[PDB]
Amino acid sequence: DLADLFPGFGSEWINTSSGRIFARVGGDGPPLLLLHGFPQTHVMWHRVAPKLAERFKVIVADLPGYGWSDMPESDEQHTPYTKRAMAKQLIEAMEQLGHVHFALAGHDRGARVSYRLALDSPGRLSKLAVLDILPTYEYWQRMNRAYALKIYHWSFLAQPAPLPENLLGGDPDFYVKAKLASWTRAGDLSAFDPRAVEHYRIAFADPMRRHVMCEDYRAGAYADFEHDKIDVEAGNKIPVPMLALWGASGIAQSAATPLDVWRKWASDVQGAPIESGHFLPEEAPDQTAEALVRFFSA
Amino acid sequence: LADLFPGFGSEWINTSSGRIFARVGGDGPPLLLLHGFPQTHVMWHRVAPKLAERFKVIVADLPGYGWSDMPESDEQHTPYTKRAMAKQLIEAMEQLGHVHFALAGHDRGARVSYRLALDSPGRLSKLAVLDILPTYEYWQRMNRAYALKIYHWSFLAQPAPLPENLLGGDPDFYVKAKLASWTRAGDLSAFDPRAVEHYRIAFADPMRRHVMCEDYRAGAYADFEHDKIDVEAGNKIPVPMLALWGASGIAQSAATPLDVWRKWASDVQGAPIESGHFLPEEAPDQTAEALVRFFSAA
């Protein structure tokens, strides 16, 4: 019994060669794909997608393996949950809608899908927005005591199965709520819509879903990092005009500005802090929506 | 629970910070053996008998571990800082009349030991640390590879009750996962099954698990801070010390251990042992011979 947090939006099951993508679709105008991250689902956009739906066809997609999207069978390399493979799957999903050139905003894992998409297939993107991430390579290259403690879950969830799966099963409700709360500015669940939290909680209550999320982070520690590394060493930069938003108290933020990081990764990047923790579209939807609307409006 | 030290006495030693449980046997110069995580004093059951031919062997449960009392922690995890555990073990040895003693530590117990040797070198005749580098060095070398190898350093250091809640769902799984994963063989075959029972039973207690996390929280914070002060002040252990490490243990990853220990100790000798992390259980002969040789010399 989950709430419909996108009234007026349609519900689409988009067939891909790797399984269905679930999407809420609303609005008209240029296509804009919105990708959620961990440990959420598409419903994390529920406060900003209506604002975007004023000017765009907004596709609010569950990542491969997340939410109501099918979970592709993983392999030893976690291939389907590498950002390269998710980007390819979402490109195929977007093609099923006849969208071969689209705007993309991603948050957290979905933002990693999104910059990887921009690196692999920049022709697919009109403009890219990434919310509160640095490239996965940068997290791993900056790995030190302080970051290891802050994003312990990057190493914890990347442990070989079934260690994180089994530990996550010890208190999945506590864990997903602890993640949501601890990454907000508030430090509790008060920034979230209780109906959205229920979406996240139900998704996280499913051990197969939790395993996918670990596959995602295992990809994030290995193949995703390797893919990123190849780009850094080749000097490959995202040519897609890009917006990098981050929470003043979000994950990506540190002394050195996330914009300065992305400038090494993107030829055309503007950025701005949002007074927010990690969950920009829910902790600060008005500031987030306006930033995206302003950046994507063309 | 099996008696793994036949002929060893049992002592509950009062300290200001709770009772320290220890098996005591042998005769000769006092030698304190300290276990680590997720073990208890019984991990010495294969080497202490040989040690007890030459030494008065005191096989203690760390403060908070095994059958030692669990001082209530605080927000700084003070009693489970290695500094505090060392002071409590000094007290305990004082109760027995041992103001100057030999000390062999493994894992967390080796962290207590080198901290003891930095804080109160006059208390130590000689020091052996088994399969560790200083906590500072683990954190200073916490790159992507090492963050994945010892993810638990950052996972168990997460604020309570996060790791405690995950560990509580299936504690047997985690303690066995840890014992297995750090051995050469990657399973539990190196361990006396009766010893595993001791470890599993200790780990079954939620308060014991909490202490373990407190240990790791101190490890991520106060312990690191205390180490940082000493390295950045150039303080070196002046106690003749033996560093043993497993060729397949934790210490050997991230750094060549003798090179690291030479920065920390003015009189250090080193020997790898073909073993995983659990030198005295995976390589009891080689470990006991190295310890006897080292402690019987000067």
Coordinates of C-alpha atoms in Angstrom, one line a residue:
Chain A
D1 CA 0.0 0.0 0.0
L2 CA 2.2 2.8 -1.3
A3 CA 1.2 6.3 -2.1
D4 CA 1.1 7.8 -5.6
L5 CA 3.4 10.7 -5.2
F6 CA 3.2 11.9 -8.8
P7 CA -0.5 12.6 -9.4
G8 CA -1.1 13.2 -13.1
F9 CA 2.0 11.2 -14.0
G10 CA 1.6 8.0 -15.9
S11 CA 3.2 4.8 -14.9
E12 CA 5.4 3.1 -17.6
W13 CA 7.0 -0.3 -17.7
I14 CA 9.8 0.2 -20.2
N15 CA 11.2 -3.0 -21.8
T16 CA 14.9 -3.2 -22.3
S17 CA 17.1 -6.1 -23.3
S18 CA 18.2 -6.4 -19.6
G19 CA 14.7 -6.1 -18.1
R20 CA 12.0 -3.6 -17.5
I21 CA 12.6 0.0 -16.2
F22 CA 9.8 1.4 -14.2
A23 CA 9.1 5.0 -14.8
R24 CA 6.6 7.7 -13.8
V25 CA 6.1 9.9 -16.8
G26 CA 4.5 13.3 -16.8
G27 CA 4.7 16.7 -18.5
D28 CA 5.2 17.5 -22.1
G29 CA 8.2 19.2 -23.8
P30 CA 11.8 18.1 -24.2
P31 CA 12.5 14.7 -22.5
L32 CA 14.1 14.8 -19.1
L33 CA 15.1 11.6 -17.4
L34 CA 15.5 11.7 -13.6
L35 CA 17.5 9.0 -11.9
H36 CA 17.4 8.3 -8.1
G37 CA 20.2 6.9 -6.0
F38 CA 20.7 4.8 -2.9
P39 CA 18.7 3.8 -0.9
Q40 CA 15.8 5.3 -2.7
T41 CA 13.6 4.9 -5.7
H42 CA 12.2 7.2 -8.3
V43 CA 9.8 8.6 -5.8
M44 CA 12.6 10.7 -4.4
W45 CA 11.8 13.2 -7.2
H46 CA 8.2 13.6 -6.0
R47 CA 8.7 17.1 -4.8
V48 CA 10.6 18.4 -7.8
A49 CA 9.2 16.4 -10.8
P50 CA 5.9 18.4 -10.9
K51 CA 7.9 21.5 -11.1
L52 CA 10.0 20.0 -13.9
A53 CA 6.9 18.6 -15.5
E54 CA 5.8 22.2 -16.2
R55 CA 8.4 22.4 -19.0
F56 CA 9.6 18.9 -19.7
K57 CA 8.4 15.4 -20.4
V58 CA 9.8 14.1 -17.0
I59 CA 10.7 10.4 -16.9
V60 CA 11.2 9.4 -13.3
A61 CA 12.9 6.1 -13.6
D62 CA 13.8 3.4 -11.1
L63 CA 17.4 2.4 -11.7
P64 CA 17.9 -1.1 -13.1
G65 CA 17.5 -3.4 -10.1
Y66 CA 16.0 -0.7 -7.9
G67 CA 12.4 0.1 -7.0
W68 CA 10.0 -1.6 -9.4
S69 CA 12.5 -2.0 -12.2
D70 CA 13.5 -5.6 -13.0
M71 CA 16.6 -6.9 -11.4
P72 CA 19.0 -8.2 -14.1
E73 CA 20.9 -11.3 -13.1
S74 CA 24.3 -10.2 -11.9
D75 CA 27.6 -11.8 -12.5
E76 CA 31.1 -12.1 -11.0
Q77 CA 31.9 -8.6 -12.3
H78 CA 28.5 -7.2 -11.2
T79 CA 28.2 -6.1 -14.9
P80 CA 24.5 -5.2 -15.0
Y81 CA 24.9 -2.8 -12.0
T82 CA 28.0 -1.1 -13.3
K83 CA 27.1 2.4 -14.2
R84 CA 28.2 1.7 -17.8
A85 CA 25.7 -1.1 -18.0
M86 CA 22.9 0.8 -16.3
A87 CA 23.5 3.8 -18.6
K88 CA 23.3 1.5 -21.6
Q89 CA 20.1 0.0 -20.2
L90 CA 18.5 3.4 -19.6
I91 CA 19.6 4.6 -23.1
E92 CA 17.7 1.6 -24.4
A93 CA 14.7 2.4 -22.2
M94 CA 14.7 6.0 -23.4
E95 CA 14.8 4.7 -27.0
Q96 CA 11.7 2.6 -26.4
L97 CA 10.1 6.0 -25.7
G98 CA 11.6 7.5 -28.9
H99 CA 14.0 9.6 -26.8
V100 CA 17.5 9.5 -28.2
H101 CA 18.5 13.0 -27.1
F102 CA 17.4 13.9 -23.6
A103 CA 18.2 15.9 -20.5
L104 CA 19.4 13.9 -17.5
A105 CA 19.5 14.7 -13.9
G106 CA 20.7 12.1 -11.5
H107 CA 21.1 11.9 -7.8
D108 CA 23.6 9.6 -5.9
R109 CA 23.8 6.3 -7.8
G110 CA 21.7 7.7 -10.6
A111 CA 24.1 10.6 -10.9
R112 CA 26.9 8.1 -11.3
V113 CA 24.8 6.4 -14.0
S114 CA 24.4 9.9 -15.5
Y115 CA 28.0 11.1 -15.7
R116 CA 29.0 7.6 -16.9
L117 CA 26.2 7.9 -19.6
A118 CA 27.7 11.3 -20.5
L119 CA 31.2 9.9 -20.8
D120 CA 30.1 6.8 -22.8
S121 CA 27.4 8.3 -25.0
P122 CA 27.5 12.1 -24.8
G123 CA 25.5 12.4 -27.9
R124 CA 22.5 11.1 -26.0
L125 CA 22.4 14.1 -23.7
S126 CA 21.4 17.7 -24.2
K127 CA 22.4 18.7 -20.7
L128 CA 23.4 16.8 -17.6
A129 CA 22.7 17.6 -13.9
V130 CA 24.4 15.6 -11.1
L131 CA 23.1 16.0 -7.6
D132 CA 25.6 15.6 -4.7
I133 CA 28.2 13.4 -6.2
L134 CA 31.7 13.4 -7.3
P135 CA 32.9 10.8 -9.8
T136 CA 33.3 7.4 -8.2
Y137 CA 37.1 7.6 -9.1
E138 CA 37.4 10.8 -7.0
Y139 CA 35.8 9.2 -3.9
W140 CA 38.1 6.2 -4.2
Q141 CA 41.2 8.3 -5.0
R142 CA 40.4 10.6 -2.1
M143 CA 39.8 7.6 0.2
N144 CA 41.4 8.3 3.6
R145 CA 40.5 7.9 7.2
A146 CA 37.9 10.7 7.2
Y147 CA 36.2 9.7 3.9
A148 CA 36.4 6.0 4.9
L149 CA 34.4 6.8 8.0
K150 CA 32.0 9.1 6.2
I151 CA 31.2 6.7 3.3
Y152 CA 32.0 3.5 5.1
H153 CA 29.1 1.9 3.1
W154 CA 31.2 2.2 -0.1
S155 CA 33.5 -0.4 1.3
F156 CA 31.0 -2.2 3.5
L157 CA 28.4 -2.8 0.7
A158 CA 31.3 -3.7 -1.7
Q159 CA 32.3 -6.7 0.4
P160 CA 31.7 -10.0 -1.3
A161 CA 28.3 -11.5 -0.9
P162 CA 26.7 -12.5 1.3
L163 CA 28.4 -10.5 4.0
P164 CA 26.6 -7.1 3.5
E165 CA 23.5 -8.9 2.4
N166 CA 23.4 -10.9 5.7
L167 CA 24.3 -7.9 7.9
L168 CA 21.7 -5.7 6.0
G169 CA 19.2 -8.4 6.7
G170 CA 19.8 -8.0 10.4
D171 CA 17.8 -4.8 10.5
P172 CA 16.8 -3.6 7.1
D173 CA 14.3 -1.1 8.3
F174 CA 16.8 0.5 10.7
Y175 CA 19.4 0.6 8.0
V176 CA 17.5 2.3 5.3
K177 CA 16.1 4.8 7.8
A178 CA 19.6 5.3 9.3
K179 CA 21.0 6.1 5.8
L180 CA 18.1 8.5 5.0
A181 CA 18.3 10.3 8.3
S182 CA 22.1 10.4 8.7
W183 CA 22.7 12.0 5.3
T184 CA 20.2 14.8 5.8
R185 CA 21.1 18.2 7.3
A186 CA 18.4 17.6 9.9
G187 CA 19.7 14.2 11.0
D188 CA 16.3 12.6 11.1
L189 CA 13.5 11.6 8.7
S190 CA 11.7 14.9 9.1
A191 CA 12.8 16.2 5.6
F192 CA 11.2 13.3 3.9
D193 CA 7.6 12.7 3.0
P194 CA 6.5 9.7 5.2
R195 CA 4.9 8.2 2.1
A196 CA 8.2 8.4 0.3
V197 CA 10.0 6.8 3.2
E198 CA 7.6 3.9 3.0
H199 CA 8.5 3.5 -0.7
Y200 CA 12.1 3.4 0.3
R201 CA 11.5 1.1 3.3
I202 CA 9.4 -1.4 1.2
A203 CA 12.1 -1.5 -1.5
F204 CA 14.8 -2.0 1.1
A205 CA 12.7 -4.7 2.9
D206 CA 13.2 -7.0 -0.2
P207 CA 16.5 -8.9 0.2
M208 CA 16.8 -9.3 -3.6
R209 CA 16.6 -5.5 -3.9
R210 CA 19.2 -5.2 -1.1
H211 CA 21.5 -7.6 -3.0
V212 CA 21.2 -5.5 -6.1
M213 CA 22.2 -2.4 -4.1
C214 CA 25.3 -4.3 -3.0
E215 CA 25.9 -5.3 -6.6
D216 CA 25.7 -1.6 -7.3
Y217 CA 28.3 -0.8 -4.7
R218 CA 30.5 -3.7 -5.7
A219 CA 30.4 -2.3 -9.2
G220 CA 31.2 1.0 -7.6
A221 CA 34.3 -0.3 -6.0
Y222 CA 35.6 -2.2 -9.0
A223 CA 34.4 -1.9 -12.6
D224 CA 32.9 1.6 -12.1
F225 CA 36.2 2.8 -10.6
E226 CA 38.2 1.1 -13.5
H227 CA 35.9 2.7 -16.1
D228 CA 36.3 6.1 -14.4
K229 CA 40.1 5.6 -14.2
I230 CA 40.4 5.0 -18.0
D231 CA 38.7 8.3 -18.6
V232 CA 40.9 10.2 -16.2
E233 CA 44.0 8.8 -17.7
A234 CA 42.8 9.5 -21.2
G235 CA 41.8 13.0 -20.1
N236 CA 38.3 12.3 -21.4
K237 CA 36.0 15.1 -20.3
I238 CA 32.2 15.2 -20.4
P239 CA 31.3 17.7 -23.3
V240 CA 27.7 17.8 -22.3
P241 CA 26.8 21.1 -20.5
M242 CA 26.5 20.0 -16.9
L243 CA 25.1 21.3 -13.6
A244 CA 26.7 20.0 -10.4
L245 CA 24.5 20.6 -7.4
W246 CA 25.6 19.5 -4.0
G247 CA 24.3 19.8 -0.4
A248 CA 26.2 22.3 1.8
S249 CA 26.2 19.3 4.2
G250 CA 26.1 16.6 1.5
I251 CA 28.4 13.8 0.8
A252 CA 30.3 15.3 -2.1
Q253 CA 31.1 18.6 -0.3
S254 CA 34.5 19.1 1.4
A255 CA 37.1 21.8 1.6
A256 CA 37.9 21.8 -2.1
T257 CA 34.7 22.7 -3.9
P258 CA 32.8 19.9 -5.8
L259 CA 32.7 22.3 -8.7
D260 CA 36.5 22.3 -8.8
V261 CA 36.4 18.5 -9.0
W262 CA 33.8 18.4 -11.8
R263 CA 35.8 21.0 -13.8
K264 CA 38.5 18.3 -14.2
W265 CA 35.7 16.0 -15.4
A266 CA 33.6 18.3 -17.6
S267 CA 34.4 20.9 -20.1
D268 CA 31.2 22.9 -19.4
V269 CA 30.2 22.7 -15.8
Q270 CA 28.4 25.2 -13.5
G271 CA 27.6 24.4 -9.9
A272 CA 26.1 25.7 -6.8
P273 CA 25.6 24.6 -3.2
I274 CA 22.1 23.8 -2.0
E275 CA 21.6 24.4 1.7
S276 CA 20.7 20.7 2.1
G277 CA 22.1 17.4 3.2
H278 CA 22.5 14.6 0.6
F279 CA 18.9 14.4 -0.5
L280 CA 18.6 17.6 -2.4
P281 CA 15.2 17.1 -4.0
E282 CA 13.6 16.3 -0.7
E283 CA 15.4 18.4 1.8
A284 CA 15.4 21.5 -0.5
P285 CA 13.0 20.8 -3.4
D286 CA 12.3 24.4 -4.2
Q287 CA 15.9 25.4 -4.5
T288 CA 16.7 22.1 -6.3
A289 CA 13.7 22.4 -8.7
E290 CA 14.6 26.0 -9.6
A291 CA 18.2 25.1 -10.2
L292 CA 17.3 22.3 -12.6
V293 CA 14.5 24.3 -14.3
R294 CA 16.9 27.2 -14.8
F295 CA 19.7 25.0 -16.1
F296 CA 17.6 22.7 -18.2
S297 CA 15.4 25.4 -19.7
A298 CA 16.5 26.0 -23.3
Chain B
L1 CA 32.7 -24.0 27.1
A2 CA 35.8 -26.1 27.0
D3 CA 38.8 -25.6 29.2
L4 CA 41.6 -25.0 26.7
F5 CA 44.3 -24.3 29.2
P6 CA 44.5 -27.5 31.3
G7 CA 46.4 -26.8 34.5
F8 CA 46.2 -23.0 34.1
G9 CA 44.5 -21.3 37.0
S10 CA 41.8 -18.8 36.6
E11 CA 42.0 -15.3 38.0
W12 CA 39.4 -12.5 38.1
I13 CA 41.7 -9.5 38.6
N14 CA 40.1 -6.4 40.0
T15 CA 40.9 -3.0 38.4
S16 CA 39.4 0.4 38.8
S17 CA 37.8 -0.2 35.4
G18 CA 36.3 -3.7 36.0
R19 CA 37.6 -7.2 36.5
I20 CA 40.1 -8.7 34.0
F21 CA 39.7 -12.4 33.5
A22 CA 42.8 -14.3 32.9
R23 CA 44.1 -17.9 32.7
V24 CA 47.4 -18.1 34.5
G25 CA 49.9 -20.8 34.3
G26 CA 53.6 -21.5 34.2
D27 CA 56.3 -20.0 36.3
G28 CA 59.2 -17.7 35.6
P29 CA 59.1 -14.1 34.3
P30 CA 55.6 -12.7 33.8
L31 CA 54.3 -12.7 30.3
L32 CA 51.0 -11.1 29.5
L33 CA 49.2 -12.4 26.4
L34 CA 46.4 -10.2 24.9
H35 CA 44.0 -11.4 22.2
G36 CA 42.1 -9.2 19.7
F37 CA 38.9 -9.2 17.8
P38 CA 36.6 -11.2 17.6
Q39 CA 38.4 -13.5 19.9
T40 CA 39.1 -14.0 23.6
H41 CA 42.0 -15.1 25.6
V42 CA 41.5 -18.7 24.4
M43 CA 43.1 -17.9 21.1
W44 CA 46.4 -18.4 22.9
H45 CA 45.5 -22.0 23.9
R46 CA 47.9 -23.5 21.5
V47 CA 51.0 -21.3 22.2
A48 CA 50.6 -20.5 25.9
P49 CA 51.3 -24.0 27.1
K50 CA 54.7 -23.9 25.4
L51 CA 55.2 -20.3 26.7
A52 CA 54.2 -21.6 30.2
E53 CA 57.3 -23.9 30.3
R54 CA 59.5 -20.7 30.4
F55 CA 57.2 -17.9 31.7
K56 CA 54.4 -17.2 34.1
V57 CA 51.8 -16.8 31.4
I58 CA 48.9 -14.5 32.0
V59 CA 46.3 -15.0 29.2
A60 CA 43.9 -12.1 29.8
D61 CA 40.6 -11.2 28.2
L62 CA 40.8 -7.5 27.2
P63 CA 38.7 -5.1 29.1
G64 CA 35.2 -5.6 27.7
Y65 CA 36.0 -8.9 26.0
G66 CA 35.4 -12.5 26.9
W67 CA 34.8 -12.7 30.6
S68 CA 36.4 -9.4 31.5
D69 CA 34.0 -6.8 32.8
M70 CA 32.6 -4.3 30.3
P71 CA 33.1 -0.8 31.7
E72 CA 30.4 1.4 30.3
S73 CA 31.7 3.4 27.5
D74 CA 31.3 7.1 26.9
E75 CA 31.0 9.4 23.9
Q76 CA 34.8 9.2 23.5
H77 CA 34.8 5.4 23.8
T78 CA 37.4 6.1 26.5
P79 CA 37.5 2.7 28.3
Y80 CA 38.0 0.9 25.0
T81 CA 40.7 3.2 23.8
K82 CA 43.9 1.3 23.8
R83 CA 45.4 3.9 26.2
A84 CA 42.7 3.1 28.8
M85 CA 42.8 -0.7 28.2
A86 CA 46.6 -0.5 28.7
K87 CA 46.2 1.4 32.0
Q88 CA 43.6 -1.1 33.1
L89 CA 45.9 -4.0 32.2
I90 CA 48.8 -2.3 34.0
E91 CA 46.5 -2.1 37.1
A92 CA 45.6 -5.8 36.7
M93 CA 49.2 -6.8 36.4
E94 CA 50.0 -4.7 39.5
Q95 CA 47.3 -6.6 41.4
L96 CA 49.4 -9.7 40.7
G97 CA 52.7 -8.0 41.6
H98 CA 53.8 -7.6 38.0
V99 CA 55.1 -4.0 37.6
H100 CA 57.5 -5.1 34.9
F101 CA 56.5 -7.8 32.5
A102 CA 56.8 -9.2 29.0
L103 CA 53.9 -8.5 26.7
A104 CA 52.6 -10.2 23.6
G105 CA 49.5 -8.9 21.9
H106 CA 47.5 -10.0 18.8
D107 CA 45.2 -7.7 16.9
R108 CA 43.4 -5.3 19.3
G109 CA 45.5 -6.7 22.1
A110 CA 48.7 -5.8 20.2
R111 CA 47.2 -2.3 19.8
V112 CA 46.8 -2.2 23.6
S113 CA 50.3 -3.5 23.8
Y114 CA 52.2 -0.9 21.7
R115 CA 50.1 1.8 23.2
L116 CA 51.1 0.4 26.6
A117 CA 54.7 0.5 25.5
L118 CA 54.4 4.1 24.3
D119 CA 52.5 5.3 27.4
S120 CA 54.3 3.3 30.1
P121 CA 57.5 1.8 28.6
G122 CA 58.9 1.2 32.1
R123 CA 56.2 -1.5 32.6
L124 CA 57.5 -3.6 29.7
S125 CA 60.5 -5.9 29.6
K126 CA 59.9 -6.7 26.0
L127 CA 57.0 -6.4 23.6
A128 CA 55.6 -8.7 20.9
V129 CA 52.9 -7.5 18.5
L130 CA 51.2 -10.1 16.3
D131 CA 50.0 -9.1 12.9
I132 CA 49.3 -5.4 13.3
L133 CA 50.7 -2.1 12.3
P134 CA 49.9 0.9 14.5
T135 CA 46.4 2.1 14.2
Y136 CA 47.7 5.4 12.8
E137 CA 49.4 3.5 10.0
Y138 CA 46.2 1.6 9.0
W139 CA 44.3 4.9 8.8
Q140 CA 47.1 6.7 7.0
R141 CA 47.2 4.0 4.4
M142 CA 43.4 3.7 4.0
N143 CA 43.2 3.9 0.3
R144 CA 40.7 2.1 -1.9
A145 CA 42.3 -1.3 -1.7
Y146 CA 42.9 -1.1 2.0
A147 CA 39.4 0.3 2.7
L148 CA 38.0 -2.7 1.0
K149 CA 40.3 -5.1 2.8
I150 CA 39.6 -3.8 6.3
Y151 CA 36.2 -2.3 5.7
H152 CA 35.3 -3.3 9.2
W153 CA 37.6 -0.6 10.6
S154 CA 35.1 1.9 9.2
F155 CA 31.9 -0.2 9.5
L156 CA 32.3 -1.1 13.2
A157 CA 33.3 2.5 13.9
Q158 CA 30.0 3.8 12.7
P159 CA 28.0 5.5 15.5
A160 CA 26.0 3.2 17.7
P161 CA 23.6 1.5 17.2
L162 CA 24.3 1.1 13.5
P163 CA 26.8 -1.8 13.5
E164 CA 25.3 -3.2 16.6
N165 CA 21.9 -3.4 14.9
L166 CA 23.3 -5.1 11.8
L167 CA 25.4 -7.5 13.9
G168 CA 22.5 -8.5 16.0
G169 CA 20.5 -10.2 13.3
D170 CA 22.9 -13.1 12.9
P171 CA 25.9 -12.6 15.2
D172 CA 27.2 -16.2 14.6
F173 CA 27.4 -15.3 10.9
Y174 CA 29.7 -12.3 11.5
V175 CA 32.1 -13.7 14.0
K176 CA 32.5 -16.8 11.9
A177 CA 32.8 -14.7 8.8
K178 CA 35.6 -12.7 10.4
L179 CA 37.5 -15.7 11.8
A180 CA 37.3 -17.4 8.5
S181 CA 38.1 -14.5 6.2
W182 CA 41.3 -13.5 7.9
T183 CA 42.9 -16.9 7.9
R184 CA 45.2 -18.3 5.3
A185 CA 42.7 -21.0 4.4
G186 CA 39.7 -18.7 4.3
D187 CA 37.6 -21.0 6.5
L188 CA 37.5 -22.2 10.1
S189 CA 39.8 -25.2 9.8
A190 CA 42.8 -23.5 11.5
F191 CA 40.7 -23.0 14.7
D192 CA 40.1 -25.5 17.4
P193 CA 36.3 -25.9 17.2
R194 CA 36.1 -25.5 21.0
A195 CA 37.9 -22.2 20.6
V196 CA 35.4 -21.1 17.9
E197 CA 32.7 -21.9 20.5
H198 CA 34.3 -19.4 22.9
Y199 CA 34.5 -16.8 20.2
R200 CA 31.0 -17.4 19.1
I201 CA 29.5 -17.3 22.6
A202 CA 31.3 -14.1 23.4
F203 CA 30.0 -12.6 20.2
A204 CA 26.5 -13.8 21.0
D205 CA 26.3 -11.2 23.8
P206 CA 24.9 -7.9 22.5
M207 CA 26.9 -6.0 25.2
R208 CA 30.0 -7.8 24.1
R209 CA 29.3 -6.8 20.5
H210 CA 28.8 -3.2 21.6
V211 CA 32.2 -3.2 23.3
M212 CA 33.7 -4.5 20.1
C213 CA 32.2 -1.7 18.2
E214 CA 33.4 0.7 21.0
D215 CA 36.9 -0.7 20.5
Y216 CA 36.6 0.0 16.8
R217 CA 35.2 3.5 17.5
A218 CA 38.1 4.3 19.7
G219 CA 40.2 2.8 16.9
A220 CA 38.9 5.3 14.4
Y221 CA 39.1 8.3 16.8
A222 CA 40.9 8.5 20.1
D223 CA 43.4 5.6 19.3
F224 CA 44.2 7.3 16.0
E225 CA 44.6 10.6 17.7
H226 CA 46.9 9.2 20.4
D227 CA 49.0 7.5 17.7
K228 CA 49.1 10.6 15.6
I229 CA 50.5 12.6 18.5
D230 CA 53.3 10.0 19.0
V231 CA 54.3 9.7 15.3
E232 CA 54.2 13.4 14.8
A233 CA 56.2 13.9 17.9
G234 CA 58.7 11.2 16.8
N235 CA 57.9 9.2 20.0
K236 CA 59.2 5.7 19.5
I237 CA 58.7 2.6 21.6
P238 CA 62.0 2.1 23.5
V239 CA 61.0 -1.4 24.6
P240 CA 62.7 -4.2 22.6
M241 CA 60.0 -5.4 20.5
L242 CA 59.1 -8.3 18.1
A243 CA 56.8 -7.7 15.3
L244 CA 55.3 -10.9 13.9
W245 CA 52.9 -10.8 11.0
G246 CA 51.2 -13.3 8.8
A247 CA 52.4 -13.5 5.3
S248 CA 48.7 -13.6 4.4
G249 CA 47.7 -11.5 7.4
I250 CA 46.2 -8.0 7.6
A251 CA 49.4 -6.1 8.5
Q252 CA 51.4 -7.2 5.4
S253 CA 48.8 -5.6 3.2
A254 CA 49.1 -1.8 3.0
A255 CA 52.8 -1.8 4.1
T256 CA 55.9 -3.8 4.7
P257 CA 55.5 -4.3 8.5
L258 CA 59.1 -4.1 9.7
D259 CA 59.7 -0.9 7.8
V260 CA 56.6 0.6 9.5
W261 CA 57.5 -0.7 12.9
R262 CA 61.0 0.7 12.6
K263 CA 59.5 4.2 12.5
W264 CA 57.6 3.3 15.7
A265 CA 60.1 1.3 17.6
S266 CA 63.8 1.9 18.3
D267 CA 64.6 -1.8 18.9
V268 CA 62.3 -3.9 16.7
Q269 CA 62.9 -7.2 15.1
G270 CA 60.4 -8.7 12.6
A271 CA 59.6 -12.1 11.2
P272 CA 56.8 -13.0 8.9
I273 CA 55.1 -16.3 9.6
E274 CA 53.3 -18.3 7.0
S275 CA 49.8 -17.7 8.4
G276 CA 46.8 -15.6 8.0
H277 CA 46.0 -13.1 10.7
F278 CA 45.6 -15.6 13.5
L279 CA 49.2 -16.4 14.0
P280 CA 48.8 -18.4 17.3
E281 CA 46.0 -20.6 15.9
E282 CA 47.1 -20.9 12.3
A283 CA 50.8 -21.2 13.1
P284 CA 51.0 -22.2 16.7
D285 CA 54.4 -23.9 16.5
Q286 CA 56.1 -21.0 14.6
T287 CA 54.4 -18.4 16.7
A288 CA 55.3 -20.1 20.0
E289 CA 58.9 -20.6 18.9
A290 CA 59.3 -17.0 17.8
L291 CA 57.8 -15.7 21.1
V292 CA 59.8 -18.1 23.3
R293 CA 63.0 -17.2 21.4
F294 CA 62.3 -13.5 21.6
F295 CA 61.2 -13.4 25.2
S296 CA 63.9 -15.8 26.4
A297 CA 66.6 -13.6 24.9
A298 CA 67.3 -9.9 25.5

